[PDB]
Amino acid sequence: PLLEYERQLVLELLDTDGLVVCARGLGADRLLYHFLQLHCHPACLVLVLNTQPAEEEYFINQLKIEGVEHLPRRVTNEITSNSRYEVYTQGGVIFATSRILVVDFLTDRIPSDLITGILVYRAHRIIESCQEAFILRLFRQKNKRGFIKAFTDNAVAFDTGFCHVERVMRNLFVRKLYLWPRFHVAVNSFLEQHKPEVVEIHVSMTPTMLAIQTAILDILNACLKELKCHNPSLEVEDLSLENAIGKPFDKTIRHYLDPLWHQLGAKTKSLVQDLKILRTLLQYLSQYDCVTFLNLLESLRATEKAFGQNSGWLFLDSSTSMFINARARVYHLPKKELVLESNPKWEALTEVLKEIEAENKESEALGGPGQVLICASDDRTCSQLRDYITLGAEAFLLRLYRKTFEKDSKAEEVWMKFRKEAAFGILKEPLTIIHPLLGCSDPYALTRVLHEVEPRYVVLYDAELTFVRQLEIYRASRPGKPLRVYFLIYGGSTEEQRYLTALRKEKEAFEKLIREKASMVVPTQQSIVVDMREFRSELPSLIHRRGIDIEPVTLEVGDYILTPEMCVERKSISDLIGSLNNGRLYSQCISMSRYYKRPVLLIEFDPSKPFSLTSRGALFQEISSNDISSKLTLLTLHFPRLRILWCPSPHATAELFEELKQSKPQPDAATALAITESEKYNPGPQDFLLKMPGVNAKNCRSLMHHVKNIAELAALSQDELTSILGNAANAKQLYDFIHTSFA
């Protein structure tokens, strides 16, 4: 079916290959499905890179619905390596993960000359994920004939100053860029002839709910300013107060702090924890009821007393205002004259549902009754909405209050008065369906629900840009059937601010992309064994570029094997500090020295921002054991055979690796791999079984056969533990561990 502007886009992409940036929610899955339907042939094989299992299953099922033989097949690590060559020879669309594709391309267990193309969904991941760049470099190194089409929503991902569209565009080997924003003439003119009957209600917050938000925002602003003060390099505009409200703030704070985490300090990590807690406090305030908010507030103070997690801001003069306001929301102490206030959004939802039911009970004869779909943010909100509708405000709030707090009857009845002051068959009646949006996991899940149940009315209890665009596209797909979308938003809150910031960020990102596109218009063999987890970095790509091939295996001893007697552990300054303090590096050195004749430790420092590697304030004090320099000296003193390589960048590390093997023989896999039941004994509960006291290897291995699960493990008494374990002391220790309070 497609559309008009969508078919123009498809024709343009069937022309000279390139990458397509659409507006958030403008049916990128539809374009991917169109290309999959095009390439479901058995005489060709294309690879789709970044897709979720749910999206892949939906695509396969829809293609089966259409009546297509030779459906797409999914290839994952579970399939045996020799069997993976079978599905490649079968042709057709192949859903593959980055890791197995890297392994297959490097080991040449894939007909790289038979690949007719590659489709890169979510092409904005090329910016930071070095695996896909390596896959595309390897593919272009062998085929040079197949196509590369890339699709992406999230035009904001190119708006950050760290990245550049030209670099990622060159990584994809495309050389042509297609921009399809929401204000594009072809799409805007077409979407104006099939617009939905949107009606939005601006629900006003309670004055008590406003004070809580004001206090939380004050605390968040203070913590952000403190974080900026301690990290002058973090003064970037990406950490403004209006950006901390948004969803993707955690990703930016990780990108700016994760590479140098262990050298950050003590207060900075606590400040990041406070930022996360304040953001989840904002979410709880805007989303859930009053009793749940009070529960989270009180539990937050409970752990501060026990450990002191939030001691920085929990005792602030503004924080006490939040506690008092929450208590006034739930309690009233003059004996508890409970208030149990409900947030206004439920009343707006009730009014909307009443109007919808009135319309249905007025116009049954004009077709069917019509179905209503309610979209909420997550599962908790959906459950709360269903309980509120089925029970009522009073019963629901009383149930929550009694379940959590102390159950009272004499005080409860006083509040009630003040508040007042068939087995089988087709339903053939209006149905209300509550659906969790889950925007972060897979935004294109609202489209599947919309196509599964065709709703005459949609209530957007929680709204994001992608869902608005999806509802706009869904209506235009049916030119005759109308729908009315209700847009419930909290007036003058952080939800409205977040939505408006998303709007303006997308618009400015698309304008910047347009300008960037305009400006750019005119322009013997040797091997190294590389650990699998090391491909999330640029070093394996730079090593391969120098002309030496890579054999990727799972290495339990070291990251690189340059020679038969050599082993390199790659540690940055942050990871070196973390491993020295943790104690992992000592065990790694022990194993490497035991197994390899020439163990090597590689440290990658930063010439631009060097780290002192010595404790601050100890420059003039005595030698401190907690210092990193002292720990490094101790380690090199206890391992005289260990050799250390210092490199300033991954580019220099590759050169050193190439030079370090000038005449030595090459290594081989299955020898470093074999350096070091397994199929049984699920890794999940195995570690939990191992870590509690009373079990080293033999007693635990014996006991897990007798006991079906750890669920009933707590049921056994001390004597049964003595009988099963074989000892009474360890059994007593385990029983005391499993049955003890917090004291």
Partner: peptide
């Protein structure tokens, strides 16, 4: 019919800088 959150998504209006901000969110 002043549903400006919806047609504001189309990004086709003038929509000066202050329109992308909420008055109560200044502090």
């Amino acid at each position: 019919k002043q549903s400006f959150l919806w047609e504001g998504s189309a990004l086709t209006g003038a929509w000066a800088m202050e329109d992308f901000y909420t008055a109560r969110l200044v502090p």
